[PDB]
Amino acid sequence: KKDTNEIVQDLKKILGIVSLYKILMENNSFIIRTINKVLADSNYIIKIIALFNTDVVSDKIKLEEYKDVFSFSKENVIFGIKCFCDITIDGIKYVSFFKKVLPNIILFQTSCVKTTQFVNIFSKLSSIVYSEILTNERLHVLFSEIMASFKTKVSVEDLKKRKVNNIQGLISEISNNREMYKNIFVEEYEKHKTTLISIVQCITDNYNINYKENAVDIEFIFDFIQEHYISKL
Numbered sequence: 001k002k003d004t005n006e007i008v009q010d011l012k013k014i015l016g017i018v019s020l021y022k023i024l025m026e027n028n029s030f031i032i033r034t035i036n037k038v039l040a041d042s043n044y045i046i047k048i049i050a051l052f053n054t055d056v057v058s059d060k061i062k063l064e065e066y067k068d069v070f071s072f073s074k075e076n077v078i079f080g081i082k083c084f085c086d087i088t089i090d091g092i093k094y095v096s097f098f099k100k101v102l103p104n105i106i107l108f109q110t111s112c113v114k115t116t117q118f119v120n121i122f123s124k125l126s127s128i129v130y131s132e133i134l135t136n137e138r139l140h141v142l143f144s145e146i147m148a149s150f151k152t153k154v155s156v157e158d159l160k161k162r163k164v165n166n167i168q169g170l171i172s173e174i175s176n177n178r179e180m181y182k183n184i185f186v187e188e189y190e191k192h193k194t195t196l197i198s199i200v201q202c203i204t205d206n207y208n209i210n211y212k213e214n215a216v217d218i219e220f221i222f223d224f225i226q227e228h229y230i231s232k233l
């Protein structure tokens with residue numbers, strides 16, 4: 001909305017933390033406060049939207065529309081945490097940091113699922129996501145194809161010539177070129193959708209990831225999100 005300046009500060013420290021376990025303990029105050037603040041701010045997604053859609057701050061109507069779609073109540077967060085615990089990964093360290101941050105998450109206590117059950121499922125998903133990003137060859141080929149396509153549309157050398165190398169310069173580049181980066185996102189997603197869904201569906205099948213004891217359906221999830229959220233932007 002107005003002071004989305006606080007989001008970029010939190011984004012700087014998060015990106016400063018990942019650039020530099022040992023770190024996580026010194027920043028656990030920052031990580032705990034940020035999660036509780038994000039979860040208690042029902043308009044947080046809309047502030048993120050307004051960071052990249054600077055025009056929205058001057059359109060009261062569309063801004064209010066966004067609250068109907070993207071605002072989440074405290075109850076929504078509890079329901080999501082509950083739904084997150086119906087995931088099982090019968091196909092399968094840092095568990096410690098999670099098991100000492102998550103108790104300090106106010107809204108994770110209002111639900112109070114078995115924290116060991118939650119820590120386990122969050123820990124598994126987190127290790128799958130990191131391992132695949134690090135090692136899935138299909139995903140690396142896909143990223144490289146996206147990157148090469150992006151580069152025929154936009155001069156990455158010229159972007160760095162114009163000081164597009166900070167997150168503030170990155171946000172400002174996107175938000176002043178919003179239609180174009182939107183069209184590039186859509187064209188890349190539609191061109192590569194068959195392989196993206198396939199990569200992710202295979203990862204879930206491989207690790208035998210279930211939701212309420214039914215196989216996860218990636219096509220349905222992506223299509224649900226397109227219809228109910230990405231299309232209302």
Ligand SMILES: CCCCCC/C=C/CCCCCCCCCC(=O)O[C@H](COC(=O)CCCCCCCCCCCCCCC)COP(=O)(O)OC[C@@H](O)CO
Pocket residue numbers: 182185186189190200221222223225226230231232233
């Ligand atoms: C960790 C949880 C994350 C969950 C989701 C979070 C991700 C958010 C990504 C934000 C990207 C911003 C892009 C905004 C602009 C999108 C386009 C749009 O807003 O509009 C249309 C939306 O439908 C379209 O297909 C647009 C194509 C996009 C559809 C794909 C998005 C699905 C993502 C699923 C995420 C799954 C999460 C868990 C993974 C197992 C574009 O469709 P077209 O009719 O072909 O073209 C016409 C456009 O010119 C009209 O505007």
Ligand SMILES: CCCCCCCC/C=C/CCCCCCCC(=O)O[C@H](COC(=O)CCCCCCCCCCCCCCC)COP(=O)(O)OCCN
Pocket residue numbers: 035077079080081083084102105107108122125126127129
């Ligand atoms: C490796 C990383 C793992 C980390 C996991 C964190 C997840 C990160 C992203 C979470 C974004 C989730 C966005 C929700 C999308 C769908 C929301 C939605 O409104 O659709 C509704 C959702 O219904 C569902 O079944 C969704 C089940 C999936 C829940 C997953 C949400 C996880 C949220 C956890 C919050 C983070 C807390 C972290 C600290 C405790 C469908 O409508 P309905 O069937 O009619 O029921 C609702 C009406 N009563």
Ligand SMILES: CCCCCCCC/C=C/CCCCCCCC(=O)O[C@H](COC(=O)CCCCCCCCCCCCCCC)COP(=O)(O)OCCN
Pocket residue numbers: 048049052053146150170174177178179181182184185188189192196233
């Ligand atoms: C260097 C590493 C950077 C990679 C990630 C980029 C960092 C920033 C990520 C941005 C995520 C923000 C998500 C919410 C943003 C809200 C988007 C939104 O409101 O929608 C549109 C505007 O917002 C945007 O354009 C955000 C687009 C973000 C995508 C940036 C990347 C583009 C494509 C590159 C790679 C393709 C990935 C595809 C994967 C299959 C609204 O369109 P419009 O208002 O109808 O047209 C305006 C004409 N005046």
Ligand SMILES: CCCCCCCC/C=C/CCCCCCCC(=O)O[C@H](COC(=O)CCCCCCCCCCCCCCC)COP(=O)(O)OCCN
Pocket residue numbers: 087125128129132133200203204209211216217220221224225
């Ligand atoms: C780098 C980004 C990767 C992070 C991914 C971490 C995943 C943690 C958060 C996941 C929440 C995503 C929200 C999904 C919302 C789906 C909307 C929905 O309809 O909910 C339900 C869809 O089913 C679900 O809820 C699925 C539950 C979430 C599964 C999460 C596991 C997928 C992650 C696999 C790992 C992929 C690694 C990717 C690496 C790049 C409706 O199901 P239903 O009630 O049984 O209806 C009948 C079924 N046809």
Ligand SMILES: CCCCCCCC/C=C\CCCCCCCC(=O)O[C@H](COC(=O)CCCCCCCCCCCCCCC)COP(=O)(O)OCCN
Pocket residue numbers: 038039044045048049067068069070071072073076077079080081225229230
């Ligand atoms: C730089 C950061 C990148 C973030 C990129 C996000 C940009 C936005 C792009 C689209 C994201 C799509 C996710 C949709 C989430 C909407 C949640 C929601 O609507 O809550 C409800 C869904 O509730 C659920 O079932 C699951 C609840 C999980 C909600 C968790 C939301 C908190 C997450 C905050 C996200 C913060 C971003 C992280 C970056 C620091 C709506 O359901 P309803 O009761 O049927 O209908 C009532 C309508 N309000």
